[model samples]
Target: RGSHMRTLLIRYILWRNDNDQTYYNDDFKKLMLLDELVDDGDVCTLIKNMRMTLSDGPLLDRLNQPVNNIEDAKRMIAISAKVARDIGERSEIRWEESFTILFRMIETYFDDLMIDLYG
Candidate 1:
């Protein structure tokens, strides 16, 4: 289930990065909110602190569960880190090409994490 959700999330990121030119009935804005929460500052803080921690924010407000929500934040942070890395590597690539690169990385990483966690 987590893997499947992550796949959907990858799709959401692609859709957003493409400037909403595609069709999707669902409002994935909350997923975007999660994505925004994983900004570079948060990633740096996580790295500097050497621990998995989620600051008090909208995610917790919506979910109303700090303990479990922290885990969800961790997942978002991992995805965000990959997205940042891909974006950084191909900064000179064309917009659409960069989108493809980022999407592929996210999908591959999510699948690998799924296998590592569930296998």
Candidate 2:
């Protein structure tokens, strides 16, 4: 089921991929990659913009869509990968934390995308 896969992905990222919290936060603290020095400035900027929009978008009105669930997990994963990979490439940061933060964000919206695709 879609929900099952999503759950697994979230779990892996959180429990498996994210093993060192100190390292994670440490990497983040060491440095930040903003507009000027980001590896792919355009794409990174766009994603940041999108995240800002998503933070305060009308999509939140989808009250009908159960925000507490995991439906948006994949989106979070995508965003995190983008930010983490970019920053990681630039700075010596591990980036898993960045990726993990994104995963946590996704967890807020995760459940399953209805993978069964059957009715």
Candidate 3:
């Protein structure tokens, strides 16, 4: 499940990039924490590092465990709650075309990681 661990983390990146949007619901706001205009330099830098080392290191040892739920998944990545409650924005440009790009980016990113870590 090392590869799946990579998948879980990479999938978080995919979802965060895709799901980022302006929300109307109070609950939606809370959940879509990364769904904002602010550059979360913290998470951005952190994930970039993860991507760089996307297929190696002791990060592997943390793999092979069962993340049966979102909570489990959150702790597994450990990037939840802290940033989840931190920020957001109202306007989005190219909002329609963004996901198209984001989806392709995710698939291509996943494809390569799959090749190196799972495929």
Q: Estimate each model's TM-score.
A: 0.34, 0.32, 0.25
lDDT ranking, high to low: 1, 2, 3
Evaluate all candidate structures by whole-model CA lDDT and list the values in order: 0.42, 0.37, 0.36
RMSD of 1: 12.0
The worst-scoring run of ten residues by lDDT in candidate 3 lies at 82-91
- Assess the local accuracy of residue 46 in candidate 3 as a C-alpha lDDT between 0 and 100: 42
Clashes of each: 0, 8, 1
Tens digit per residue, CA lDDT, model 1, 1-119: 44575545556545543444454426354444345445566545433332233222322222232223334543553444334333333223233443344344344455554444445
Which tens-of-lDDT digit does each residue in 1-119 have in candidate 2?
33453444433333323345543532232122222232355446654654656431222222123334443443444334344443332233333444444444554343333331221
Name the regions of candidate 2 deviating beyond 4 angstroms: 1-43, 46-71, 88-90, 108-119
Q: Best lDDT goes to which candidate?
A: 1
Candidate with the larger TM-score of 1 and 3:
1
